Design a protein around this ligand. Structure first.
Ligand SMILES: [Zn+2]
Length: 56
């Protein structure tokens, strides 16, 4: 991301798991966060992990 840190304790350092975006605000929280840092409503959805080519 535009904020290019060296390596936080997040998925920035080569992870296939994306971040979670609040379905209320659209606030994307770290995979470490338990809930939204906007409304604290625990209403987050992790972005489409997607697939490589086939299922598995
Ligand atoms: Zn929210």
């Amino acid at each position: 991301m535009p904020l290019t840190d060296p390596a936080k304790l997040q998925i920035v350092q080569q992870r296939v798991f994306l971040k979670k975006v609040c379905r209320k605000c659209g606030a994307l929280n770290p995979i470490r966060a338990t809930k939204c840092r906007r409304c604290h409503s625990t209403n987050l959805r992790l972005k489409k992990k997607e697939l490589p080519t086939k299922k598995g």
